[PDB]
Symmetry: C2
Subunit: 339 residues, 2 copies
């Protein structure tokens, strides 16, 4: 019962006010997550704003602002000095990493819409995002949205692996969680990013897997041109989550898939997981993330393959898709079990 074309002035005032306050609420979701407040509310159901502000050493006027923003749209409810969870808390909290990703992570790009859209401006470094904030968001995105299907695919391997290479390894939590499932297994993360190596080795060292899991720097689209080559022969499980769309355009994907095939010829299973572009979803029925993901990629000039485009690329890439998993529900996201 949504799509009217004609409304009262009163309705339009309220609607436009809501969009405005949604913006502040949106940013506040990610911030309340990162400052601990969404967790207190999840656990205790309620909190005392002054008490919260003191405990965490926060400027209280601004802390009232954050909660009022959440409350302007029903995520929480304010009662005197108390904030309780509101009718929309669970959903918002479930998707809190997506909001963080939108604001804290990608705000700078969406803010500069008017500078970024002009063609004369689109070369070299023409936008900025917060790498550390994205990383922070993508850690929970990976867990909350991709783990079930990732683990489901690991359960369906039909063999117990021995050496697992992970493309776009970032934090290293993927490899680490593998280590624990398959006691003896060794691992080899790969990034095109320097602070991913360090953050990982530190986190690896921090959990007792230093002796096994090592890392490397290299663009995974040209993995043959990476000095770790020699060890790629012993690897019997490849993985690649939240970065496959970078392999594109199509022809560069084909190439990259082919080159990966040769560089890892002992790989039995290759688990590939990513979000895809949607098609034909109606403007007023777009779910969370979809618009953010697609629109931001369109602004960065980065290509986003639809799900069909992935499907029709694997053969030529030198791979066969033997199982496919739908993600709940990070737009249209998928896990492919390739071999």
């Amino acid at each position: 019962s949504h799509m009217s074309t004609e409304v009262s002035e009163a309705q339009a005032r309220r609607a436009v006010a809501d969009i405005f306050n949604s913006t502040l609420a949106s940013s506040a979701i990610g911030a309340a997550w990162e400052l601990g407040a969404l967790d207190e509310l999840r656990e205790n159901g309620k909190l005392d704003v002054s008490d919260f502000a003191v405990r965490h050493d926060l400027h209280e006027p601004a802390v009232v602002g954050m909660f009022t923003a959440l409350a302007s749209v029903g995520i929480v409810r304010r009662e005197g000095a108390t904030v309780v969870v509101g009718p929309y808390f669970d959903e918002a909290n479930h998707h809190r990493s997506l909001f963080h990703w939108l604001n804290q992570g990608s705000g700078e790009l969406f803010r500069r819409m008017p500078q970024v859209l002009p063609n004369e401006n689109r070369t070299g470094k023409f936008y900025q995002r917060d790498a550390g904030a994205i990383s922070y968001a993508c850690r929970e995105i990976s867990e909350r949205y991709f783990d079930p299907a990732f683990w489901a695919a690991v359960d369906g391997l039909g063999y117990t692996p021995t050496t697992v290479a992970d493309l776009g390894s970032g934090s290293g939590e993927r490899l680490i969680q593998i280590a624990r499932r398959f006691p003896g297994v060794r691992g080899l993360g790969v990034d095109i990013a320097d602070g991913a190596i360090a953050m990982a080795e530190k986190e690896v060292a921090a959990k007792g897997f230093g002796d096994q899991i090592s890392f490397v720097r290299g663009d995974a689209r040209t993995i043959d041109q990476v000095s770790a080559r020699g060890e790629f022969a012993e690897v019997d499980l490849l993985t690649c989550f939240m970065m496959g769309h970078l392999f594109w355009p199509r022809e560069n994907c084909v190439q990259t898939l082919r080159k990966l095939r040769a560089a890892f010829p002992n790989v039995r299973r290759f688990l590939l997981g990513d979000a895809t572009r949607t098609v034909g979803i109606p403007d007023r029925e777009l779910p969370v993330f979809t618009l953010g993901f697609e629109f931001g990629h369109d602004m960065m000039g980065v290509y986003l393959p639809t799900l069909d485009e992935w499907d029709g690329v694997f053969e030529e890439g030198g791979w066969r898709c033997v199982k496919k998993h739908a993600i709940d529900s990070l737009s249209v996201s998928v896990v492919f079990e390739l071999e």
Copy 2:
């Protein structure tokens, strides 16, 4: 408090999408799209992208964000104004302010709230962007009350001073209305001064209107060549809250009094902090203005606070105008 799981999905999806809508409104305003939709009721994105030399897929995204909350509707490459177009287009400059102007502040909420961080230049805003939005906010929301106040001055100014002069447009319009008038702008920012000097010169007012770099809070320290004595009309719009806290405001009001001994009327327009509006009934702007200033550590007075400060500050409020409707905003006529 009780809703279905599907209502909840939809509402959270709307909040997410609104974020991108909010940002798009300011972009669309800036890039010509809203003006083009006011006139023709429609627009073609291919046509549009081309005319403006913009990356069309990003242009489609922009319009899909606005379509996603009913500001416009899409019919293939044909955008038609939506059910909320008039209201959104009306407040476009407020959305601009929120996102393009003040986006970096609200983005860094996690870094900006911890007291430890609250020293130095702990936040950032886009001066160019903000300035760009305040031009329209000034004209769209304050002008009616502003010109009503000028009509009922009870005299005709000979020399006007404008505090936080910005673009210089207020002084230009004053000169258009009163052709013999001398004009004087104080702004604390070299960039405003330079821009205003430009515009004033370009338009042919270089003789009448001139500018000095200054902090209106300590107006008593601004050299100005003795010209403050000749001023008989004082204007100050959209910066008065920076006089606060209260003891500072009383002081700044006494110093304005003294620096401008021949001012007959002092016209002061600002938005104020509201009280007791229920969370789910906040109108546009109110939350962003208040929340942002709390984040920046800047005091925002209520209207009653303003009313209660004038006497101790050396002035008598003789006329008050309500503004429609930029949160609770007002123009005071002081003497």
